[PDB]
Amino acid sequence: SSSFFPDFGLLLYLEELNKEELNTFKLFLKETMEPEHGLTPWNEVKKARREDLANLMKKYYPGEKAWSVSLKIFGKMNLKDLCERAKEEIN
Amino acid sequence: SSFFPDFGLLLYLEELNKEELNTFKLFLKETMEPEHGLTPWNEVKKARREDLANLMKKYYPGEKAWSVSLKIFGKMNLKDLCERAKEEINWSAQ
């Protein structure tokens, strides 16, 4: 098997995130989780510190799911960066 | 209606600077390989923003384009973060 993302990857990249980006990460996670987990696991995520957040991902999204979901979240965060940046270019 | 494929993909693809676009194509090359090989690569590499958007709709119609685009943009974000951590972990690599 492979792609031990939550244990060896995720925590490093979450740490590289600033406070705002980390919240944005949590926000996009809430979006992908709610339709399937509702807002029940949400409270843990918002207050979850980076290492706690990594554990949560491993819990709810086992196997390569954590990697796939993370990539999509990082993608949207990137789109948000681009949208905000384009919005900056328009003004 | 499909907003992402017709106007979405092209819009943010348009927001990419020259270097960011090359990284995008490179990640696309990586994503297309398992089924299309390096056959469409020569076309993708030189394709301007409008042509590139058209190519993806061809190979990835419907929600195919969205999933592929999101992951490509994600890999781009990770690459930026990876480069930064790499310098923070080791002050002598660049």
Residue numbers in the entry:
A (entry chain A): 6 to 96
B (entry chain B): 7 to 100
The authors write:
Here, crystal structures of human NLRP14 pyrin-domain variants are reported. Structurally, NLRPs share a conserved tripartite domain architecture consisting of an N-terminal pyrin domain, a central NACHT domain (with reference to its initial identification in NAIP, CIITA, Het-E and TP1) and a C-terminal leucine-rich repeat (LRR) domain. The death-domain fold consists of six antiparallel α-helices packed around a highly conserved hydrophobic core with Greek-key topology.
To investigate the functional role of the human NLRP14 PYD, we set out to crystallize the wild-type protein. The asymmetric unit is built up as a tetrameric arrangement resulting from a dimerization of dimers. Each of the four crystallographically independent NLRP14 PYD monomer structures adopts a canonical pyrin-domain fold with its N-terminal helices α1–α5. The dimer encompasses an extensive interface area of 890 Å2. Nonetheless, the dimer constitutes only a minor fraction as shown by gel-filtration chromatography. Together with the thermal stability experiments, we conclude that the wild-type NLRP14 PYD will be mostly monomeric, with its C-terminal α6 helix contributing to the hydrophobic core only transiently.
